[PDB]
Amino acid sequence: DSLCNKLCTFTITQKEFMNQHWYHCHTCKMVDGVGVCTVCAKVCHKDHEISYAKYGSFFCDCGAKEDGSCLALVKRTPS
Amino acid sequence: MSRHEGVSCDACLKGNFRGRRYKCLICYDYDLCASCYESGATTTRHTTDHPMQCILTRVDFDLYYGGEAFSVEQPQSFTCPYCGKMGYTETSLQEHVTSEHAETSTEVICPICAALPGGDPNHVTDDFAAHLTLEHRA
Amino acid sequence: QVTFPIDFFEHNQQLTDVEFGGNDLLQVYNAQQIKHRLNSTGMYVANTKPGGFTIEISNNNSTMVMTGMRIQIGTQAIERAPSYIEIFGRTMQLNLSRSRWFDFPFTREEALQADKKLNLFIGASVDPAGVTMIDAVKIYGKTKEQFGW
Ligand SMILES: [Zn+2]
Ligand SMILES: [Zn+2]
Ligand SMILES: [Zn+2]
Ligand SMILES: [Zn+2]
Ligand SMILES: [Zn+2]
Ligand SMILES: [Zn+2]
Ligand SMILES: [Zn+2]
């Protein structure tokens, strides 16, 4: 319920870098300079092989995807 | 340099072996190879509980300390020759000896000039505190 | 499989008052040096012990309890990077294609057991030279009041 109301950081960060926690989702072959925020790791990449990258300057790449595959860009109704 | 020239393991009787040379800090002029050391090779005079010093080759040195400017002539790990404690710097080793073992006077082979290239590999001192404070000071 | 929260390390602080050692590592290095190379980038920690080697992680702060760890591996050599690690009876493999960070959050029981000291075994790498290579090791924890000690 609480996680549903949480939105992805990208909607605030956009193509700019805030200081935030970010991870590495190795299932999506996106590491090093590419990662996700907490919400996208929890929601957009559930059950994926996710390793915490660091807390630092970053912008969420899952929300940066232009195909709209990011499920955390909008509020989600609990099932 | 990738072989411990002039030193042979006393368990497997192999000379100029490649890897980590192991020197006993209580036990006189007996050395062990990495394989024999990990296998718990013990003799009538040497036991696994003996404090243990490790000396590397130049290839082993720049493999282990890759990225740093430390050289073979500057050992960085010294073993407490009474305690079995390991991984002390020169200052750390002398502080440990002065604090925890001030009144210990058992004979030992001191790790530093034993692992120091060109030093005495089997230097015997009944006062290793005097060793650390007199000639072993940086 | 103990399913941990993904944001676990967000709710935990990196700890600088942590000492690293162990007879497997203390043979070659000293505790201050191990701390320096596990808390900084550009350099690493090696061990040519076949089968693996043990790292002893000690806490110098009595008001803080260990909650997880993170290990950076693969910057120097992926082959020399270890195949697997083990801690508190739990073993996880390291299938590596490049340099990356591996996480291991502690359970509440594991966190309780890691109040002062803990042991982390590291399996031998796939390197034909038998060199096990770990670049950096960062440890996370929480205060005793927050942990509910
Ligand atoms: Zn996101
Ligand atoms: Zn994913
Ligand atoms: Zn997303
Ligand atoms: Zn041997
Ligand atoms: Zn001996
Ligand atoms: Zn001692
Ligand atoms: Zn000496």
JSON list of C-alpha atoms in Angstrom, two decimals, chain B residues 21 55 72-75 112-123:
[
{"chain": "B", "resi": 21, "resn": "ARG", "atom": "CA", "xyz": [57.51, -18.52, 2.43]},
{"chain": "B", "resi": 55, "resn": "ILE", "atom": "CA", "xyz": [57.65, -13.49, 3.40]},
{"chain": "B", "resi": 72, "resn": "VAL", "atom": "CA", "xyz": [60.14, -5.97, -1.05]},
{"chain": "B", "resi": 73, "resn": "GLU", "atom": "CA", "xyz": [62.72, -4.15, 1.09]},
{"chain": "B", "resi": 74, "resn": "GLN", "atom": "CA", "xyz": [59.81, -2.69, 3.10]},
{"chain": "B", "resi": 75, "resn": "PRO", "atom": "CA", "xyz": [57.86, -5.50, 4.78]},
{"chain": "B", "resi": 112, "resn": "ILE", "atom": "CA", "xyz": [61.02, -7.86, 10.97]},
{"chain": "B", "resi": 113, "resn": "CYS", "atom": "CA", "xyz": [64.67, -8.41, 10.02]},
{"chain": "B", "resi": 114, "resn": "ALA", "atom": "CA", "xyz": [63.77, -12.05, 9.38]},
{"chain": "B", "resi": 115, "resn": "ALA", "atom": "CA", "xyz": [61.44, -10.85, 6.62]},
{"chain": "B", "resi": 116, "resn": "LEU", "atom": "CA", "xyz": [63.67, -7.88, 5.76]},
{"chain": "B", "resi": 117, "resn": "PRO", "atom": "CA", "xyz": [65.75, -8.63, 2.63]},
{"chain": "B", "resi": 118, "resn": "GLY", "atom": "CA", "xyz": [69.42, -8.76, 3.54]},
{"chain": "B", "resi": 119, "resn": "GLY", "atom": "CA", "xyz": [68.77, -9.05, 7.28]},
{"chain": "B", "resi": 120, "resn": "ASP", "atom": "CA", "xyz": [69.26, -11.95, 9.65]},
{"chain": "B", "resi": 121, "resn": "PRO", "atom": "CA", "xyz": [66.57, -14.57, 8.89]},
{"chain": "B", "resi": 122, "resn": "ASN", "atom": "CA", "xyz": [67.08, -16.31, 12.26]},
{"chain": "B", "resi": 123, "resn": "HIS", "atom": "CA", "xyz": [68.11, -13.49, 14.60]}
]
